[PDB]
C-alpha cells in the first residue's frame, strides 16, 4: 500500500544513499537477476561461466561479420567465427589476470547446500581464486563455442525490411 | 653502459634495413633526386592504392 | 613530512589570528611564555589533508605552507573511495 | 535497517554519503546536543530536521563532521562530538581524548616545531646524502 | 563610514582612502584593488547586508542601457541617413553592395573605402538596416534623420528616469516584492501593444509603399510623406474600406474578397522576402494573445498544486524566494533570452522576414552568427548566475526541503549520467570522422562512411522535412508551398541575380555534424550543470562555500583542489561553448554555399558557390581544411591593398591576441611576482618604483585575462575570415 513500500530510501538508513527507487529495486526488476550472480551466488560459479560465456558468445557476430572490416563476406569462414573467436581469447584473459586480484585460496566445495545460506556476509569477496578460475574457465568454453552456433546457423535472417 | 648499448641496436638496424632491400646497388650506380629507401612498410590496414 | 609545511611564526597567539583547518591542528601547547605564549608549528598531523588554509590567516613570516608531504595517504588524499 | 533502528538524525535518502570503503576501512560518525527541533544544512547537499538524541549521524570522512562544526556553531550550542569507527572497534579515538576545543592547555602531545634547526638561513642546502649514521630521520 | 554619517553631510565624499570590505583598502597602498572594483563593482555581498536598495539600483542601470541602445542607432540611423548609400541602393537594390560608413583619408586609411555604391566609396556593411529599412516607405535621408533624433529624444529622458530613480529619493520593497501583476501588463500591452501597434504602421503605410515599389520608380515618384489617413483612396488598392462588413463578425458577403492578410507561405519573386502580407496578419494574430493573456491574474496558487511521487513537494513554494532572489531570476531568463535568440538564427536563414535577404548572402549570416554567439554567450551566463544563486543570496536556510533539496539529494547522479552520455558521443560523435582519415588515407572507400559507401543509399528524403512541405493534407489550408522554402518538396524558382533558397536536402554528412553538435552541446552543460549543482558543498570540500563562488582554488592538498569552485566551471564552460558556437557557424556557411547559395543562369542551372564539394569531403575532417580553412581563407590572405583589407589586416592581430591568451591561460602566478621584483629592484636603484605596491595578477584575474582574450582573439579571427568570403564572389 505504502506510497512506495513502507517508504524507505535504501534498505533502511538514509545515509548511504542510492536513493533506492525503481530500477534500483522493484519487485519486477529485482527478480530478473538471481541464478546469476546478482544477489546470492547461485551455484559455485563453474556453470554460470558458460551461460555467461555462451550468451555473450554468439553475440559479436553481425558486429564483426556484418560490420566487418571489408564487410558483407563471401568466405566460408564468416558469418563467422573468424576474428571474433579471437576476441573471446583476448577477452578471456584479459579476464584471467584479474583473478589475481583475489586469490584467497581454498577448496571448501559448496554448490551443495546446508542451511539457508545468508552467505552470511557475501557482500564483498569471499570468492577465492579457486572459483574465479572455474568461471573464466567456463568463459573460454562459452566464448569460443558460443561463437559457432552463431555461424553454424544458416542465417534465415531478416532483411532490413 | 646500458647506454652506448642501445645506440648500437639502433645503428645495427639502420644498416640492416638496408642491403637485402632499398638500394644501394641502384643508388650508387648513380643517384639522381628520386627516392632512395630505408625500409619496407608492412601494414594490414593498407588498401591496394 | 609526512606532513611538513612550516607555518610557524613567533607570536603563535591565536585570537583574531587563525583556527581554520579540518582537525589537523591542536595548538595551545604553550612554550614558557611568548606574550600570548601558545606556540609551535603543530599538534600531531597524521590525520588530515593538505590546505594552506593553514596560514591564509595568522602569520608564518618566512614560508606560506602548502601541498607538501609527498608521502601520501589515502585519508590524507580525500579519495580512496 | 529495521530490526534495529537506533536512529537519532533525520534525512530521508541521498546519493551523497558513504559508499563501500567505509566498511573496509575507517568509519567516522559525529554526535551532538540539541534544544528544540531545527532544520539543517548538511554535508552532501541538503537537509533535514534534528530533535534529539543520541543525535548520532555518521559520516564518510573527518573533514565532513568538523565541516559542520563550523556548520554547527553558527546556530550554536556547545557539544559536538566526532568519533572514528572501524570495522572492528578501536584505536585512533578522535574527539574524545583530553578536553576539547583546541585553544586550551592541559598538555603538549605534539608538534615541536623546527625539526633540527630554525627558519633562519636555509639558504643552506640539504646536506649529507642520506646515510644511516646522522640524525635526519625526524 | 562616517565620512560623515547620516544627518549633516550633504557634503559629498571625494577623498580619504576608499572603500571596501572593512579592513578597507588599507590606507597603505596596493595595485590589486584597482583591478578589484571594476570586477565585482556590483557583486552584492557588499554595499548592504539588506537587499533594501539594490533592486532600487538595478532598475536604474537598466535605464542606462535602454538609453545607450538609443544613443546607439540614433547613431546607427544617422550614419544610415546622411552617408546615404540607401537612397541610392533602393531604386537600385541587387546592384548596390551597401555602406553607411566612411573613414576620412588620413595616413594609410582609405585603402579601406572601396566603391560600394550608387557611386560612392564606402565600407560595406553587414547588419541590415537597408532591410529593416525597406519597410519605411516614404523615404529620404533627412528623416531617418528624424527617426534618428526621435532616438536621442528617447534617451536623455529614458535616461533621466534613472536620475528619476536611485539618485532621487526613491522607492521601496513592496513594489517589486509585491510582483503580483508584472507580466500582467508587460505581455498584455507592449508585447501586445507593440506587434499590435506595429500592425498599425505595417499595412497602414508600409505594405502599400512597397506594394508598388516591387516594380521600380524613383521613390516619391511614389510616396508622399503624410498622405496616409482619413484619406484613403490608396488602401482601395491593396483592398477595400470593408465596404460593408461591421467590426468583422458575420453577416458578411464575399463573392470576391477576404481582408488584407491572405496568408503567404512562400517567397516574393523579384523581392524574395516572403510576403509582406502575412506580416500584418501574423503580428495581429500575436498581440491578441498578450492582449488576451496578460490578463492573468493577481500566485503560489498554480505552482502550489500538482505534486507527484517522484515529483516535487518543493514544486510548492518553489520559492517564496523567487520574488526575491534576483540573481536567480536573471539566471532563469538568460537560458531563455539566450536560448530564445539562437532560435532566431534559424527561422531567419530558412525563412527571411526582410525584403532582399539571401540574395544578400553576407548581410544575413553575419547575422546568423552574431545572433548565435548571444544564444550562447548568454546561456553559459544563465548558469554562472544560478551558481551565484546556489551559493549566496538569501540571508538564511529557509528555502527548505524541496524539489531542489530534492535534485541535490541526487547530484553525484544527474551528473553521473550525462557523463557517459558524452563519451558515448565523442566516440560515436568524432572518432567517427577519424575513421575516414585513417581509412581513406589507408584508402579503401568500400568501407568509409561516405554518403555513398556505407549504406543508407541515395535518399535522405523522408523524415519530417518531406512531411513538412507537402504541408496541406491538412486542417492546413494554405499558400502554395511551405512554411520554409528549403523543405524538400517544391519549387525551382527563387530570385534574380542569384539563387536565394532551395531544398538543402541533407543525407549523411548532415547526419554526423548534427551529431557532433549533440556531443558538443552535451559536454558543454556537463561542466556547467555539475558546476552550479556542486556550488556550495562537495565531496572534496564541505567547507567549500565559505568565501566564494570565485576562490582561486582551495589549496594544493586533496591531490588537486584547484579548479573546483564554479566561476571556473563558468570558465571551462565558456572554453567549450566557444567551440559549440564556433563549429555551428563552421557548419552553416560550408553548407549554405556548398549547397543553396547559388546562381541562376539560363535554364536555371544552379551553380553553387561551390559545386557541392561537401558531398564526400566534409566527412574527412581534413576536407574541413582542404575544402574549408585552406580553400576559403584564400580570400583572407589575398585581401591586401583593397577596401575590405581591414579584415586580412585584423586576421593577423586577434589571430595574435588569441595566441597571447595561452600566456595568461597557461602560467603560474608567484612567477610574474618572482619576476615583478627583479623589475622592482632595478626600479629602486634609480629611485623610481615602490609607492602603490605593484603586484601580479589575482590568480583568478589571470584566468579572467585568459578566456576573455582567447575568445576576442579566436572569434574575430573568423569575423575577419568570414567578411572576406561573401563580399567578393558569394
Ligand atoms: C542579464 C545579465 C547580466 C547582468 C546584469 C550581469 C551582472 C553581473 N554579473 Mg554577470 N554574466 C552574464 C550576464 C550578466 N551579468 C553573462 C552572460 C555571463 C557569462 C559570460 C556572466 C558571467 C559572470 C561572471 C563570471 C561574474 C559575473 C558577475 C556579475 C556581477 C558583477 C558585475 C561586474 O562587476 O561587471 C564586470 C565587468 C567588467 C569588470 C568589465 C570587463 C569586461 C571585459 C572582459 C571586456 C569584454 C571584452 C570586450 C570585447 C572588450 C571591449 C573592446 C576592447 C577590445 C576595446 C553582476 C551582478 C561576477 C560576480 O562576482 O557576481 C557578483 C562574476 O564575475 N557575471
Ligand atoms: C548628474 C549626475 C550624477 C551625479 C553627480 C551622480 C552621483 C552619484 N551617483 Mg548616480 N546616477 C546618475 C547621475 C549622477 N549620479 C544617473 C543619471 C543614474 C541613472 C542612469 C545614476 C544611477 C546611480 C546608481 C545606481 C548609483 C548611483 C550612485 C551615485 C553616487 C556614486 C557615483 C559614482 O562614483 O559612480 C561612478 C560612475 C559614473 C560617474 C558613470 C555612470 C555610468 C553610466 C550612467 C554612464 C557610463 C556608461 C558609459 C557608456 C561607459 C561604458 C563605455 C566605456 C567603454 C567608455 C554619486 C553620489 C550610487 C550610490 O548611491 O552609491 C552607492 C548608486 O550605485 N547613481
Ligand atoms: C611575443 C611573441 C612572439 C611573437 C612576436 C609572436 C607573434 C605571433 N604569434 Mg606567437 N607564440 C609565442 C611567442 C610569440 N608569438 C609563443 C611563446 C607561443 C607558444 C609556443 C606562441 C604560440 C602561437 C600560436 C599557436 C600562434 C601564434 C601566432 C602568432 C602570430 C599572429 C599573426 C600576426 O600577429 O600578424 C601580424 C600583423 C598584425 C598584428 C597587424 C596588426 C593590425 C591591427 C591589429 C590593427 C593595429 C593594432 C591596434 C592597436 C589594434 C586595434 C585595437 C584597438 C581597439 C586599440 C604572431 C606573428 C598565431 C599565428 O598566426 O600562427 C602561428 C598562432 O595562433 N603564436
Ligand atoms: C544480420 C545479421 C547478423 C546475423 C545473421 C545476426 C543473427 C542473430 N543475432 Mg545479431 N546482431 C548483429 C548482426 C547479426 N545478427 C549486429 C550488427 C548486432 C549489433 C549489436 C547484433 C546484436 C544482437 C543482439 C543483442 C542479439 C543478437 C542476436 C542474434 C540471434 C538471434 C535471432 C533473434 O532475433 O532471436 C529470435 C528470438 C525468438 C525466436 C524468441 C541471431 C543468430 C540475439 C537475439 O537476436 O535474441 C533475441 C541477441 O539479441 N544480435
Ligand atoms: C553606434 C555608434 C557610435 C559609433 C560606434 C559611432 C562611430 C562613428 N561615428 Mg558616430 N554617432 C553616433 C553613435 C556612434 N558613432 C550617434 C548617436 C550620433 C548622433 C549624435 C553620431 C553622429 C556622428 C557624426 C556627425 C559623425 C559621426 C562619425 C562617426 C565615425 C567617426 C569616429 C568618431 O566618432 O571619432 C573621431 C565613427 C565611425 C563621423 C563620420 O561619419 O565621418 C567619418 C561624423 O563625424 N557620428
Ligand atoms: C492600434 C492601431 C492602429 C492605429 C493607431 C490606427 C489608427 C487609425 N486607423 Mg487604423 N487600422 C489598423 C491599426 C491602427 N489604426 C489595422 C491593423 C487595420 C487593419 C486590420 C486598420 C484598418 C483601418 C481602416 C480601414 C481605417 C482606419 C482608420 C484609422 C484612423 C481612425 C479610425 C481608427 O482606427 O481609430 C479611431 C476610432 C474611431 C474614429 C471610432 C486612425 C488614424 C480609418 C481612417 O482613415 O480615419 C477615420 C479607416 O480608414 N484603420
Ligand atoms: C511515480 C508515480 C506514479 C506512478 C507509479 C506512475 C506510473 C505511470 N505513469 Mg504517471 N504520473 C504521476 C505519478 C505516477 N505515475 C504524476 C504525479 C503525474 C503528474 C506529474 C503523472 C503524469 C503521467 C502522464 C502524462 C503519463 C503517465 C504515465 C504513467 C505510466 C507509464 C506507461 C506504462 O508503463 O504503460 C505502457 C505499457 C505498455 C505495455 C504499452 C505509469 C503506469 C503515462 C501513461 O498514461 O501510460 C502510458 C503518461 O505518459 N503519468
Ligand atoms: C493611454 C492611451 C493610450 C496609450 C498610448 C500609448 C502610450 C501606446 C503605445 C504603444 C506601445 C507602448 C508600443 C510598444 C511597442 C514595443 C515594441 C514594438 C517593442 C520593441 C523593441 C525592439 C524593436 C527591440 C528589438 C531588439 C531585440 C529583438 C532584442 C534586443 C535587440 C533589439 C533591441 C534590436 C491609447 C493608445 C489607447 C490611446 C488612449 C490613451
Ligand atoms: C609600438 C607601440 C605600440 C604598439 C602597437 C602594436 C604593436 C599593436 C598591436 C595590436 C595587435 C597586434 C593586435 C590587437 C588587436 C586588437 C583588437 C582585435 C581590439 C579589439 C576588438 C574589437 C573592437 C572586436 C570587436 C568584435 C566583436 C563585436 C565581438 C567579436 C568579434 C570582433 C572581435 C569583431 C602602441 C602604438 C600601441 C603604443 C606605443 C608603442
Ligand atoms: C544539381 C544536381 C541536380 C539534381 C536535382 C535535379 C532534379 C530537378 C531538375 C533540375 C532542378 C533545377 O530546377 C530548374 O529546372 C529548370 C532547369 O532545367 C529551369 O526551368 C525553367 O526555365 C524555363 C523557362 O520557361 C522552363 O524550362 C521552365 O518553365 C522553368 O521553370 C528552372 O530554372 C528550374 O525550375
Ligand atoms: C603574463 C602573466 C602575468 C603578468 C601580467 C601582468 C603583470 C599584466 C599587468 C600589466 C599592467 C596591465 C600594466 C599596467 C601599467 C600601465 C597601465 C601604467 C601606465 C599607464 C599608461 C599611460 C601606459 C600574471 O600576472 C599572471 C597571473 C596569473 C596567471 C597568469 C599570469 C600570466 O600569464
Ligand atoms: S598561525 Fe602562526 S601566528 Fe597564528 S597561532 Fe599559529 S603559529 Fe601562531
Ligand atoms: S590544511 Fe594544512 S594546516 Fe590545515 S589541517 Fe590541513 S595540513 Fe593542517
Coordinates of C-alpha atoms in Angstrom, one line a residue, chain A residues 13-142:
Chain A
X13 CA 19.2 4.1 6.8
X14 CA 19.1 7.2 4.5
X15 CA 22.7 8.0 4.9
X16 CA 24.5 5.7 2.3
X17 CA 22.1 6.7 -0.4
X18 CA 21.4 5.2 -3.7
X19 CA 18.0 6.7 -3.4
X20 CA 16.7 3.3 -3.9
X21 CA 13.9 3.7 -6.4
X22 CA 12.6 1.8 -9.4
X23 CA 15.4 0.5 -11.5
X24 CA 17.3 0.0 -8.4
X25 CA 14.6 -2.0 -6.6
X26 CA 11.3 -3.1 -8.0
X27 CA 9.9 -6.5 -7.3
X28 CA 9.8 -6.6 -11.0
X29 CA 13.4 -5.8 -11.8
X30 CA 15.0 -7.2 -8.9
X31 CA 13.9 -10.6 -9.7
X32 CA 15.2 -10.7 -13.3
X33 CA 18.6 -11.5 -11.9
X34 CA 19.2 -14.2 -9.2
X35 CA 20.5 -17.6 -10.6
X36 CA 23.0 -15.1 -11.9
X37 CA 25.5 -13.5 -9.5
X38 CA 23.3 -10.5 -8.6
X39 CA 22.1 -11.4 -5.3
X40 CA 23.4 -14.7 -3.9
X41 CA 25.8 -16.9 -5.8
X42 CA 23.6 -19.4 -7.4
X43 CA 26.0 -22.4 -7.5
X44 CA 29.6 -22.4 -7.0
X45 CA 30.2 -20.5 -10.3
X46 CA 31.6 -23.0 -12.5
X47 CA 28.4 -23.3 -14.6
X48 CA 27.3 -19.7 -14.5
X49 CA 30.6 -19.3 -16.6
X50 CA 29.2 -20.6 -19.8
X51 CA 25.6 -19.2 -19.8
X52 CA 27.8 -16.1 -19.4
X53 CA 30.4 -17.2 -21.9
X54 CA 27.8 -18.5 -24.4
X55 CA 25.1 -15.8 -24.3
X56 CA 27.8 -13.2 -24.7
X57 CA 29.2 -15.7 -27.1
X58 CA 27.0 -15.8 -30.2
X59 CA 26.9 -12.0 -29.8
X60 CA 29.8 -10.5 -31.6
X61 CA 29.0 -11.9 -35.0
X62 CA 27.0 -9.4 -37.1
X63 CA 29.0 -6.8 -35.2
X64 CA 32.2 -8.3 -36.9
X65 CA 30.6 -10.3 -39.8
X66 CA 28.0 -7.7 -40.9
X67 CA 30.1 -4.7 -39.8
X68 CA 33.4 -6.4 -40.5
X69 CA 36.4 -4.6 -41.9
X70 CA 35.7 -5.2 -45.6
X71 CA 32.1 -6.2 -44.8
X72 CA 29.2 -8.5 -46.1
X73 CA 31.6 -11.5 -46.6
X74 CA 32.0 -14.1 -49.4
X75 CA 34.1 -16.6 -47.5
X76 CA 33.4 -19.9 -45.9
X77 CA 34.7 -18.6 -42.5
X78 CA 32.5 -15.7 -41.6
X79 CA 29.0 -15.3 -41.0
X80 CA 31.7 -16.1 -38.8
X81 CA 33.9 -17.4 -36.1
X82 CA 36.9 -15.8 -37.7
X83 CA 38.4 -12.9 -35.6
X84 CA 35.6 -12.9 -33.1
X85 CA 36.7 -16.3 -31.7
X86 CA 40.0 -14.4 -31.5
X87 CA 38.3 -11.8 -29.3
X88 CA 36.9 -14.2 -26.8
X89 CA 40.6 -15.3 -26.3
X90 CA 41.9 -11.8 -25.8
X91 CA 38.8 -11.1 -23.7
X92 CA 39.1 -14.3 -21.7
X93 CA 42.4 -13.4 -20.0
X94 CA 42.3 -10.0 -20.0
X95 CA 39.8 -11.8 -17.8
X96 CA 42.2 -14.1 -16.0
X97 CA 44.8 -11.6 -14.9
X98 CA 42.1 -10.0 -12.8
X99 CA 41.7 -13.3 -10.8
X100 CA 45.0 -12.3 -9.5
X101 CA 43.2 -9.6 -7.6
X102 CA 41.6 -12.1 -5.5
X103 CA 43.4 -15.4 -4.9
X104 CA 42.3 -16.2 -1.3
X105 CA 42.8 -19.8 -2.0
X106 CA 40.8 -22.9 -1.0
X107 CA 38.7 -25.7 -1.8
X108 CA 35.7 -25.7 0.5
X109 CA 33.4 -27.0 -2.2
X110 CA 29.8 -26.0 -1.7
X111 CA 27.4 -25.9 -4.6
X112 CA 25.7 -28.3 -2.2
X113 CA 23.6 -26.5 0.4
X114 CA 23.3 -26.8 4.2
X115 CA 21.1 -24.1 5.6
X116 CA 19.6 -21.2 4.0
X117 CA 22.8 -19.6 3.4
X118 CA 22.6 -15.9 4.0
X119 CA 26.0 -16.5 2.6
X120 CA 26.3 -14.6 5.7
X121 CA 28.4 -11.7 4.7
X122 CA 28.6 -12.4 1.0
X123 CA 28.7 -8.8 0.2
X124 CA 32.4 -8.3 -0.6
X125 CA 34.6 -11.0 -1.7
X126 CA 34.7 -14.5 -0.4
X127 CA 35.5 -15.5 -3.8
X128 CA 38.7 -17.3 -3.6
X129 CA 40.9 -17.6 -6.7
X130 CA 39.8 -21.2 -6.9
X131 CA 36.4 -20.0 -8.0
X132 CA 37.3 -17.2 -10.4
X133 CA 39.2 -19.8 -12.3
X134 CA 36.2 -22.1 -12.9
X135 CA 34.3 -19.1 -14.1
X136 CA 36.8 -17.7 -16.6
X137 CA 37.4 -21.4 -17.5
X138 CA 33.6 -21.6 -18.3
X139 CA 34.2 -18.3 -20.1
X140 CA 36.5 -19.8 -22.7
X141 CA 34.1 -22.8 -23.4
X142 CA 31.3 -20.2 -23.6

